Amino acid sequence: MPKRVALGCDHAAYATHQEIMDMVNASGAASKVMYMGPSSDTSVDYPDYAAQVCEAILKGEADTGILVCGTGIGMSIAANKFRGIRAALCYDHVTAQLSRQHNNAHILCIGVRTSGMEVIRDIIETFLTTEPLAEGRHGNRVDKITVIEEEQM
Amino acid sequence: MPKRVALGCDHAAYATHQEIMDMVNASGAASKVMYMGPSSDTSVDYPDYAAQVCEAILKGEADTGILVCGTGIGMSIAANKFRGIRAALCYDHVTAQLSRQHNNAHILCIGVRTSGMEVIRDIIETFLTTEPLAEGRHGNRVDKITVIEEEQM
Amino acid sequence: MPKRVALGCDHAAYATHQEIMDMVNASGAASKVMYMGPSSDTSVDYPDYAAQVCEAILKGEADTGILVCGTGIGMSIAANKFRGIRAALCYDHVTAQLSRQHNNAHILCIGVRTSGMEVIRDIIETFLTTEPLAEGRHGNRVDKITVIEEEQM
Amino acid sequence: MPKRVALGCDHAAYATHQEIMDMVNASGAASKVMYMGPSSDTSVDYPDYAAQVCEAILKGEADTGILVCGTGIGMSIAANKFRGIRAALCYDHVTAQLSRQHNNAHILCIGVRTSGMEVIRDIIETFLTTEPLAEGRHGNRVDKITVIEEEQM
């Protein structure tokens, strides 16, 4: 089923954010794309936009998220600090596919200063169209992540 | 100053783990390397080994960690669930460098089914020898990650 | 139509060559896979094996080639020295796809010390199943490569 | 010794070409940077610009070249068709380093639709500052490439 996508970014992606939104829409796999990054040419702090996208997902306003910074890495760290969210840094087709098949990730994290736009297109299209694999071992690992999060409190 | 490194992995890296430990030692940037992945040829669950390395760092038994799974992504997610830890998935020199310069990451997460061994060598050597940049904006972002983690509780 | 694949490599891929051949066979897109790299654990020179694969293609013993060295780069250079051959270094899905769509490459060049095995699987499967795009501009560029080669003599 | 660099590209890099030239200059490793790609916003054919850069090197107007297309791959193929030129497609630090250490490449080939700009910065700086390794085995392989080229005629 197509997905409701929340897209957040910092200023690193401000120049390209509409191009990225266009990819999401053109993928066929989104029923809605919501932009929650900066709407001005200002420097901003990626954790703040990570939090916007995480909270959209947690409140059921979006099903899936994409977070864009210079490398993806800050986005990945900040998003994973939210209880109930699994955020995957992906930089190619295989990481995009396995972040869904194995890690059943809610959020795709990408870098616009590291990945070119055609690679970002493939990553997005793969992430949005890949389902978590039915073999029980990957789900069991995901459940262990949940146990860690709960224990951390 | 050379660092005390905790290396954890799942079974994806079992075949290569001693080669990876050898890289860490040969880098010149480690005063000690401790292996905390599997010591048998069994299937295991990466979150369990992520937790070992996180807890080594948090207890001051290691200064820095390296976590290895098939892609790095599961390691990144699981490690970031620990309070006080920032875990960076890196797949090249620039991500290794910026994970330290900008995100001041405690843990390097890599994939042995995605990155070849010479790329892993460069990633490791860069991660272990790069310091966090003194411009205040990156530290401020890191502090925001801490605030998120604290709020999540 | 499935393809007849000649696989060549230097000693960098000797440990993994049968795993790579297995991927080619499992792709569904090969009617035959022929190994023309080293069948011993000796150091060898990649141009010699590049030439084997190039000559297989030129004589019609294979339709397509895969060349494996530490990075792919030496293979790419050496193969491209053959008249009538276009050899593409690929390291992800998008380069594999466009090396066929745009550059209509005969030979895939990969690095086993740079690309992990699951990325190599995706590269191979994509390269073998992607056809050259019908828009005339890419073919025209390919024809210009032919003119350069002919002029060089 | 700093190098005289010829930079060529097709229209894929037209938007970013001055940013790339700026990187080359800022690297410290160039005594001159000459742009030989398109100076208009028109569609063009990458082999034509590959040839410009190859001929600059062969005539001694430049010491080294950088060629930029959407992926690098077309540039790599076309440049390698010139007698006396070795052209390396690079997408990270390790490929940049080994393209010089091992393959003693004259031309760096990069993709602006595949590699982000910070990765391109690292690639360029590494390529321009890395010398060919003195162990005889890599030079001997390079000499074999020369023999192939001569035989092809």
From TrEMBL, chains A, B, C, D:
The protein's Enzyme Commission number: 5.3.1.6
Single GO biological process annotation from the record: carbohydrate metabolic process
Classification of source organism: Eukaryota, Discoba, Euglenozoa, Kinetoplastea, Metakinetoplastina
Molecular function terms, GO-annotated: ribose-5-phosphate isomerase activity
Swiss-Prot/TrEMBL keywords: Isomerase
Family the UniProt entry places it in: Belongs to the LacAB/RpiB family.
One Pfam assignment: LacAB_rpiB
Domain of life: Eukaryota
Protein's UniProt name: Putative ribose 5-phosphate isomerase
Native species: Leishmania infantum
